[PDB]
Amino acid sequence: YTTLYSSYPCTKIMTSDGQFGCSSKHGGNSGILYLIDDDESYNNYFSYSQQKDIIVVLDTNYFNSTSVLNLHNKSKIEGIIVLTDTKKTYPYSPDSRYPNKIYGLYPNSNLEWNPNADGFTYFSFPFPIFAIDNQTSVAIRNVSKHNRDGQYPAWGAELDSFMQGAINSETCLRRGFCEPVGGQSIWSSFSSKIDKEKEIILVMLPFDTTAFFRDLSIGADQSSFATVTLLSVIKSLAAVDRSSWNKEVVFAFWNAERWGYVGSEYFINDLLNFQCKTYNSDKSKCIDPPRADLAFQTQINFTKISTIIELNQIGRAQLDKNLGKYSLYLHTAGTKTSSVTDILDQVASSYENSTITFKPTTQTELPPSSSMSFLKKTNKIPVVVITDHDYKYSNPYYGYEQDDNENVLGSTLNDIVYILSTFIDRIAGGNNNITIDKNFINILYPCFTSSITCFNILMKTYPLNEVPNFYSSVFGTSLTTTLSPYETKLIHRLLYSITQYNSTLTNCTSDNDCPSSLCYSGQCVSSNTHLHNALSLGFDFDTSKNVWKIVNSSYPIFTESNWDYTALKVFKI
Ligand SMILES: *[C@@H]1O[C@H](CO)[C@@H](O[C@@H]2O[C@H](CO)[C@@H](O[C@@H]3O[C@H](CO)[C@@H](O)[C@H](O)[C@@H]3O)[C@H](O)[C@H]2NC(C)=O)[C@H](O)[C@H]1NC(C)=O
Ligand SMILES: *[C@@H]1O[C@H](CO)[C@@H](O[C@@H]2O[C@H](CO)[C@@H](O)[C@H](O)[C@H]2NC(C)=O)[C@H](O)[C@H]1NC(C)=O
Ligand SMILES: *[C@@H]1O[C@H](CO)[C@@H](O)[C@H](O)[C@H]1NC(C)=O
Ligand SMILES: *[C@@H]1O[C@H](CO)[C@@H](O)[C@H](O)[C@H]1NC(C)=O
Ligand SMILES: *[C@@H]1O[C@H](CO)[C@@H](O)[C@H](O)[C@H]1NC(C)=O
Ligand SMILES: [Ca+2]
User: Fold this and answer.
1) Are residues 529 and 553 in the same domain?
2) Nearest residue CA, atom 24 of ligand 2?
3) Ligand 4 mutation target, pool 352, 353, 435, 436, most atoms within 8 A of CB
């Protein structure tokens, strides 16, 4: 009877063995609003029976596994609303102690890279949980508190978030009530065609993120600080004379990495194993098996990849009181890595005002990283994973809504873009003087860490949610019906544009008007930039039953519930 539109639901995700996340009952959940905002109201919950059906409103300091799981009541809890008008006053991660442990290089590892984590995200809730935006939280905190008088023209709410998929992935897939968690990765080169005689420098990062409330998955340190960094590096490199480069550089933005590295794994699998049985007319696509773009097969030789650089949480570099500089940490693997890290050290020291210094790790295992997918295949090349931590994550809010613009060091971004741009130029064989594109940095940084309203001129739609959120969501309904959220399309169209080598006035009104190119506002634009499937190898699509099938559960199996609609309504009882 009063719909609150900026609401962010907890949704249901199925796995091989079970399920986690939340759902409302069929027809939604409703109850009296009860506010927990201090120890007093917390304790007074256990003895509160003015009503059967209760919607608990939580100050976020009380939203954690221990605190929520202890809410046992004779009344039954019908839902939770989490307020975001205040932040947590302590470090908090609802994610795993070792994200993606079993899908990486060290399945038997005893390390805990994220040791503060309480794993709250991976519990199965039989009632709905919503977060709400700042303004709405203020209002709901107000009315939920007003209920404390105890007289009954009181305030209540209804939470609608019915998840069709349930139980486990085998079950929901069979019924068509869920879809694989996945999406599209994006890679790019400034070369119009990669010289298959040159070695390739691969510079990459995981751009997808996680959260309890996935519509709020900014993941500033987790991913998006690095995403801004690498795009800003690419924009800066777009303006230099790259004619001196004797190696190819490929930039890769891997999707759905937080769900078992499926983006890097799928791409690598295709590099090593793909064979097309049936091509389309101009052989630009494969009909069987379906691939919308064959550039990877045409241009990229796995064995020519001769260096891998990965960005993996670089927005909370640690202040060193000695040097008066912030530390990033170099986690290395493969062979002949000191040659590469020596250049990084040099660039970081090359100018007086640098606020960045590099340190080695003390750990003997790489942290969870996309480079792990390549190291499963080769140990022959130098791999450098750049992070902001030696061991324990510097990110105090890993996989959580509070991993936002206030969780990262904007003041280090220019230095990191400059250092990485210059570094890449040097190892590609150049000696250019880099000027970073500050205008671009200043637009993109708040765009991906606060409010995703930038570069909409490149888009055909406006985003429904202005909170940047990089959760991969679902791959699609089949291999021929792929889906991508706004965030992926924006990264794709922006990367494509920055790396363009040609643009022609044609008055095109759609990409199909443009031969071997894309349409941007009446220009046909040419760029060596490409989408690629990011999807577990454990799935296959049966065109017979027209359904996804689990063919190998050794690969990551995550399938997000389908749902019709989500809504939060407040009303007087
Ligand atoms: C998860 O959330 C709960 C709920 O807030 C956290 O428990 C709370 O932790 C704080 C700090 O430890 C406790 O506050 C302290 O109270 C004492 C005595 O009352 C006071 O001397 C201190 O100055 C501070 O106020 C608070 O009482 C406690 N509340 C409850 C109900 O346990 C918990 O720490 C969080 N846990 C995790 C893993 O994040
Ligand atoms: C992919 O690139 C690799 C590495 O350059 C090529 O494989 C090699 O062939 C060259 C000589 O032609 C040698 O330098 C290497 O000893 C070979 N190593 C192997 C076989 O791993 C290979 O030619 C390229 N692959 C394709 C499909 O052309
Ligand atoms: C909510 O917005 C208010 C008003 O702008 C601001 O003071 C407060 O810091 C914000 N809260 C959070 C947690 O962002
Ligand atoms: C470095 O930073 C200082 C402090 O802002 C600035 O005044 C100076 O011009 C810069 N110096 C150089 C060498 O760039
Ligand atoms: C299952 O996939 C694993 C991937 O870790 C692979 O090693 C194995 O060959 C596969 N087994 C089957 C069912 O083919
Ligand atoms: Ca086209």
Assistant:
1) no
2) 301
3) 353
3-class secondary structure, 508:
strand
- Residue 88 in contact with ligand 1 by CB distance below 6 A: no
Which residues lie across from 7 on neighbouring strands?
132
**Shared-domain flag, residues 187 and 217:** yes
**Entry resolution in angstroms?**
2.0
Strands (E), 298-389: 305-311, 318-320, 325-333, 356-360, 383-387
Residues 313 and 388: beta-carbon distance below 8 Å: yes
Q: 9 CA to middle of ligand 1, Å? A: 26
Ligand nearest to the CA of 61: 1
**φ, ψ for residue 174 (rounded to 5)?**
-55, -40
Pair 93, 44: CB distance under 8 Å: no
DSSP state of 422: H
Bridge partners for 572 per DSSP: 155
Alpha-helical segments (H) within 205-261: 225-238
- At residue 421, what is the residue type? S
CB 317 within 8 A of CB 326: yes
CB 417: neighbour CB atoms within 10 A? 26
Q: Looking at the 3D structure of the chain, how many domains does it have?
A: 2
> How does strand 305-311 pair with strand 383-387?
parallel
Counting atoms of ligand 1 from 1, which one is nearest the CA of 42?
31
Helix axes 225-238, 486-498, angle to 10 degrees: 20
Ligand minimally distant from the alpha carbon of residue 304: 2
Q: After which residues is the chain broken (C to N over 2.5 A)?
A: none
Residues spanned by the domain of 36: 1-181+536-573
**CA 292 to ligand 3 center in whole angstroms:** 44
Pair type for strands 383-387 and 325-333? antiparallel
Do 411 and 526 have their domain in common? yes
Residues 330 and 187 in one domain: yes
DSSP-assigned letter for residue 410: G
Q: How far apart are CA 182 and CA 314, in angstroms?
A: 24
Examine the domain organization and report whether 128 and 59 are in the same domain: yes
User: Phi then psi for 91, rounded to 5 degrees?
Assistant: -65, 145
Could you give the count of Cα atoms lying within 13 Å of 276 in the half-sphere of its Cβ?
18
> In whole angstroms, how far apart are CA 496 and each of 104, 203, 230?
30, 16, 14
Task: List Cβ neighbours of 553 (8 Å cut-off, separation of 6 or more).
Answer: 16, 538
Report the distance separating Cα 488 and Cα 452, nearest Å: 12
Determination technique for this entry: X-ray
In a shared domain, residues 211 and 128 = no
449 CA → ligand 4 middle, Å: 28
Cα dist from 437 to 144, 233, 235, 309, whole Å = 48, 8, 7, 21
Nearest bound ligand to the CA of residue 38: 1
Same domain, 97 and 235: no
Whether 199 and 224 share a structural domain: yes
